[PDB]
Design an enzyme around this catalytic site. Sequence first.
Site, PDB file in Angstrom:
ATOM      1  N   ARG A   9       0.812  -1.112   0.034  1.00 22.36           N
ATOM      2  CA  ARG A   9       0.190   0.028   0.009  1.00 22.36           C
ATOM      3  C   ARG A   9       0.990   1.242  -0.123  1.00 22.36           C
ATOM      4  O   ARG A   9       0.236   2.461  -0.283  1.00 22.36           O
ATOM      5  CB  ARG A   9      -0.980   0.063   1.104  1.00 22.36           C
ATOM      6  CG  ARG A   9      -2.120  -0.859   0.979  1.00 22.36           C
ATOM      7  CD  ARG A   9      -3.315  -0.464   2.223  1.00 22.36           C
ATOM      8  NE  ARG A   9      -4.641  -1.255   1.758  1.00 22.36           N
ATOM      9  CZ  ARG A   9      -4.889  -2.519   2.011  1.00 22.36           C
ATOM     10  NH1 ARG A   9      -3.829  -3.050   2.552  1.00 22.36           N
ATOM     11  NH2 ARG A   9      -5.978  -2.912   1.707  1.00 22.36           N
ATOM     12  N   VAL A  10       1.894   0.999   0.284  1.00 24.14           N
ATOM     13  CA  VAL A  10       3.059   2.320   0.158  1.00 24.14           C
ATOM     14  C   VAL A  10       3.521   2.620  -1.189  1.00 24.14           C
ATOM     15  O   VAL A  10       3.137   3.620  -1.961  1.00 24.14           O
ATOM     16  CB  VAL A  10       4.036   2.252   1.085  1.00 24.14           C
ATOM     17  CG1 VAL A  10       5.167   3.285   0.718  1.00 24.14           C
ATOM     18  CG2 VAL A  10       3.827   2.355   2.369  1.00 24.14           C
ATOM     19  N   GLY A  11       4.034   1.533  -2.112  1.00 24.20           N
ATOM     20  CA  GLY A  11       4.479   1.495  -3.400  1.00 24.20           C
ATOM     21  C   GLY A  11       5.708   2.206  -3.670  1.00 24.20           C
ATOM     22  O   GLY A  11       6.696   1.992  -3.009  1.00 24.20           O
TER      23      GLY A  11
END
Lengths: 143, 65, 40, 140, 183, 272
Positions: free
Chosen positions: D1-3
């Site tokens: 979810r950070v990426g």
Amino acid sequence: FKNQLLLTLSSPSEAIYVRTPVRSVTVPGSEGAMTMTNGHSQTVARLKAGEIIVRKGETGDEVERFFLSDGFVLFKSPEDDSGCCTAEVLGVEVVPVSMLDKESAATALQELLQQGAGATDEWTKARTLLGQELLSSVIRAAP
Amino acid sequence: MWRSSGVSFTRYASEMAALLRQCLKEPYRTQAMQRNQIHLKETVYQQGQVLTRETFNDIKKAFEA
Amino acid sequence: SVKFMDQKRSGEETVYFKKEDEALLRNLLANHPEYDPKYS
Amino acid sequence: RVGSAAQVKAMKQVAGTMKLELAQYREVAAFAQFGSDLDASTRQLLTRGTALTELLKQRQYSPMKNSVQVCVLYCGVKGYLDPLDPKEISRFESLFIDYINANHQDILKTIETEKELSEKTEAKLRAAVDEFVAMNEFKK
Amino acid sequence: ITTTKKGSITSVQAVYVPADDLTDPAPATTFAHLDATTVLSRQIAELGIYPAVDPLDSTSRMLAPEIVGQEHYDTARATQKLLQDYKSLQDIIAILGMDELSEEDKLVVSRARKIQRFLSQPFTVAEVFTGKPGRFVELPETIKSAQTILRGECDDLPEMAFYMCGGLEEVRSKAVKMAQEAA
Amino acid sequence: DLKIVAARMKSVKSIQKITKAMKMVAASKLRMDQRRLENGLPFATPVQKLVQRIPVDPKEKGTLAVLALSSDKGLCGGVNSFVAKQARIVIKENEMAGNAVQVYGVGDKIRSALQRTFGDRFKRIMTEVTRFPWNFGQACIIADRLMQDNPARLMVIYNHFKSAVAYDTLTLNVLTPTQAAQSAKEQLNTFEFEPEKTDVWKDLQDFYYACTVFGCMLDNIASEQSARMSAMDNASTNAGEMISSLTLRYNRARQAKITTELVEIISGANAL
């Protein structure tokens, strides 16, 4: 359409021509070679071997050579509305002359003569003789 | 030469096209003998009761047997 | 569907490789005579 | 979810490509058992996906650095492994690593310092890759 | 139950798995407590492959290149890759058939099947069930035979000969016998 | 239960995936088969149209031979079904008048379809044919076998390939040496035969036999591949439907398991 000759020269693996308009086409009949043009009579003939020679209307002088093993020729008169006269050259194996070789040809001739030297069966003798014919034609036709 | 030898025109034409294919150039000759390999399996019957079954991978043995 | 697929697969493989093993048993002793007890 | 926010640009430049390539491979994976009949533009995807999967393979207790990772993934995504036998990629990688750690520590230090894969470093990298391929011989 | 600096206890625990469900809490909690693991299967025991060990669920802390050499490690991993490929072709075979498979896939399937047959071996304790005598297969012999089978030296040999054979030489002996009775 | 529905969903999902893959593969094979057709039909049509000028009556009495062309793989739709249907029709029509029928076939499917009913009429069967492309297994061999086993009248049943989604089953009444000898061939007097007619007829007739089988089997192959694509479509659709149903059942059984275990826990907590 036009008062040309609609050639179709076809083998099972490849149709080289479909409705090609040409001027004159030479073909190696079983008796001897002969040349079909527009106006030629309805005829059927069996072929033996050699170099079909096609000559387009756009070419006139330039040609296209194709080697045929065996097959048939069917020349059909022109329909009244088509204005053009058609011809069908069917060959069991139609190669060009560019794709032929004289060395593998002579090797196969040698191996055929080797196999047929033990002449016992009629079909073996006949096959040896016919292979000699076709391979001599290949040698004489290749460049 | 074939109705005397007890041979068919199709057999003669095939057996001669084979030699012609043998007289080809290697790049096209590969594709030719490729597209003209053989694989069949004949199975002979007589009111049922199979008489024989036999495979064929060569033109000459296929026409002979 | 499950036993159906499994048994169909097993039967097909069994038949196929039975044929292949028959052929290999035919053509073994020629290409591998060092095992053939005919020469021992 | 950070990426990609948790990624240096030197890794972005290759991962943004590899993600799409592996997605396409996952979209056309089942065709690997029928690729003999298919066409190009669908066999190339399978080849590149297989090459990348074999490049991402790794050994237990043998981790690499980010510079080496960027170099290797550039070699992978830029098509220098499509014509190879996949079983040889572990060699390719190993030899290339030794080569660069012997020869182009300047490249590795630049990538580690700037955290970017500039066009000059990319030209140096393609040069080193071509030199390595010339010096070495692979199966396919 | 553990080795110490005064002695050692090698332990071997049989774990009932009710309804063949490995998600049960007792096995789930017990997998973490073991150095070596060996999972038996019904889908395999139905094939007469005894011992009916699943080599894709069996594991071991010992199977590492530093403990057992790379000749062992790579052989084991190649065997597992082959068996997973064969498992990843079961549906294609069940639906379409062997006609659709390439010769690579046929060779892989044949090697996987041969490996499965080779793994099964007779036991002395099972003589009152099978009648066949028991075998003791040393590890270098096993590694040689597996390397051979994966290299492709024995693909020509039939699968049946491979089945229920302690050693590769025995496989050769049974293939010779089957060819003799074949002719 | 849960294991059943999960295994079913897994198997059907695999089925759908493989079905889509085989759909694309069959589309490619149909492309290449259309190519072989377009190349190999001109070789056959002219001589067939030539010999068809001699009209064949299908009411003639004599030893019939029915050559039924079919495939060796399944999932071909119902093309071999229609072929065997037409063959049964022909056999039951021609055995009433008293014509003794013999059956030649191509493929195992026709054999399996007509064994129990017309296995006392088989003469010769060929199979393992289309492992490769078509003229691998040359039609010349089968034509030679027919001529060696020369019947008095010959019929050929096959599937014509109209378009990629449409075929058509046909029966070709084929001329034989008996039917040629019983005619003076006045219809070919418009044609010049370079060797004489009597000497070239026997060599032309074998070519006619071979070319007839060739085009017929090419058309049958193309129809087979079209039906295969259609079957893959229908199978993938049915697999999607079954996956939906099994997903519903799986969620139902999941909720049931949860409720049951929870009620067990609650009753064991309240039974102290």
